[PDB]
Symmetry: D2
Subunit: 204 residues, 4 copies
């Protein structure tokens, strides 16, 4: 989990990277964006960068898996959010002064160390996201999936298993299960104050 300070740096970094990229058509050097980044940005974790304009979605791309360091993923996601979202036209430079940035940061996935019959009780609906990995098969469902679609812990484990391409009961037979959380930091005004949204799901 990121502190308020780290959360603020996250959005500032996303905003900076985009503005830099919209100007010189090139991404900034990871450690030379003009934002102080604590060592947490070196951790491998997923993230999503959301852009809103006039209260409407303007673009959003992200890394669900911790395939990249937080730093790299923010850079890539932010530039992708403003220029690679096929649902929207590329954002122009002067548009950013009217665009609001949102950064959803996922925690480093940690293996739930329990026995098959204990797993349901260790999976918290509304807080946890899951990754099921067995052999070379891997699958994941974001935290909002379970609460927004009325799934209990047993349901969540089973759907994530099938998401991985495995049998729904794979978790019952010992499939490796990892859990992770998320947090959202967002601009209250362009380049302004940053607020934190604890809930990733709309409804539960």
């Amino acid at each position: 989990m990121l502190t308020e300070t780290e959360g603020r740096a996250a959005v500032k970094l996303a905003r900076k990277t985009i503005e830099i990229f919209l100007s010189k058509g090139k991404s900034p050097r990871p450690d030379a964006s003009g934002v102080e980044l604590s060592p947490v940005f070196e951790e491998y974790r997923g993230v999503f960068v959301t852009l809103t304009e006039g209260g409407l979605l303007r673009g959003c791309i992200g890394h669900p898996y911790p395939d990249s360091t937080l730093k790299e993923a923010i850079l890539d996601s932010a530039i992708s959010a403003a220029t690679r979202d096929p649902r929207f036209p590329t954002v122009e430079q002067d548009e950013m002064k009217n665009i609001l940035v949102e950064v959803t940061i996922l925690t480093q996935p940690e293996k739930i160390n329990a026995s098959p019959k204990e797993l349901p009780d260790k999976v918290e609906i509304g807080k946890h996201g899951l990754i099921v990995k067995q052999g070379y098969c891997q699958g994941l469902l974001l935290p909002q999936v379970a609460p927004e679609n009325d799934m209990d812990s047993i349901d969540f484990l089973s759907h994530t298993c099938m998401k991985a391409g495995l049998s729904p009961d794979a978790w019952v037979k010992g499939a490796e299960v990892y859990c992770f959380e998320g947090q959202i930091f967002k601009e209250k005004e362009p380049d302004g104050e940053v607020i934190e949204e604890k809930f990733l799901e709309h409804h539960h």
Copy 2:
């Protein structure tokens, strides 16, 4: 799909219903809200009422299934989003002047009339939410589920079947499949202009 006019009427109904219930303690009569409602409100469709305060989630409750008329669904969902969301404290009367009201309206679910071999090509990821029905058993998944969790048509059909408590291949064996879409109307400001968000999914 609701027109701008109807969408505006929907959000207004949500606000009024909440303000009235918060005022006294008796849910006003749906048609007796003071808000004009076209015949679209007599249609059976699912809905969600979302409240935000200062850019942060303040409450949200809904009924995804089309079991009540739009009018009644909004009514119930609105008061519940404000007083029955176990995630937040009850909304106080004086808080509504600082709250933004959002209303997500789902379309009347329509049966996909295609053989099992053709069903996947009928399901559009990003637009369609699904309902699988078999006898009295029924299950549904919101439109945003597939796009946000990298599921294709086949995955969505299989997952919705399991959500219904049925085998993942139930759709392959002729189980009924219904699809639906949604739209969001939200206040740019309390009791102010209402805009339309056509995207139910954050990312795809």
Copy 3:
């Protein structure tokens, strides 16, 4: 479990029913077959009637579910095995003196009263056959299925759930689980000595 006598009566009933049907062309009166029948024959349980000739399958029909009393189930399965097996022509009257009769009797299915956490431990592979029921959905898998296809308790419960048209994890969620056993009684010689085969499965 049927006794040696009851089992002997089972085969004799099956054999006599056929010899009588083949001759006069009608089914004997259920209680005027010529074989003593204990009260076990009034219990609702499944059974199969097998006919072999010269060491080869000649016919086989049965009732997997306890839809009928043992008596009724045997008369019907016996006549069908001799005259209604689409894999073979109808048996001739002179053929019965060259045919061996086999009868597989299943026990009345009994609900396993255990929590999902206990279910796998209560299901004995190689002995138990399963029936899963949850509402109007019902499915069963014979005792030999699990041991012949290398399935453990967990696998067997999941496969029976899907057989019932339900999600594989239905048992983890509280779906009703019923177990049953079986035994085979067969003629060592035409209308001769009846021996009991305790294993319904070829391998395990």
Copy 4:
């Protein structure tokens, strides 16, 4: 598919492997004319019956070994490694009937998922679902005996491989195979062939 001649050689190989092992407590290979079919990789089961009752049966469903090797191993295990029965004594073989179930080499079904259910024949085909290093198989008698159509069979085999039931719909490889049974009508005597692997359909 094995010829009748080969079918007879398979049961004799099974019977002799057991008598010899039961004699000097170990194994060779023989004295039985074996055609090249015994060098093919295919599953097999060896069954022993005595007095019309099962006396032992062990087998390898998957074609992990050549038929020859699978037969020797299965036969010896059927007589000395089946925990359901006590070990068979030397004197017992003269009163035991030998049965050998030989499965064909699994052949890939080359069709689109839409066509697979049409290619699977209930009653004849057994299935192996393969996706990477994950494999699963269900014997031919499974579908007809438990009232499963093609779709059911494909889905259950996918789960048997530890995969999602809809894996076959998503392109997982499917292989089909058949089997045949050759059995002794008399100890060390005549060998007939049972055409039906399923009890009931």
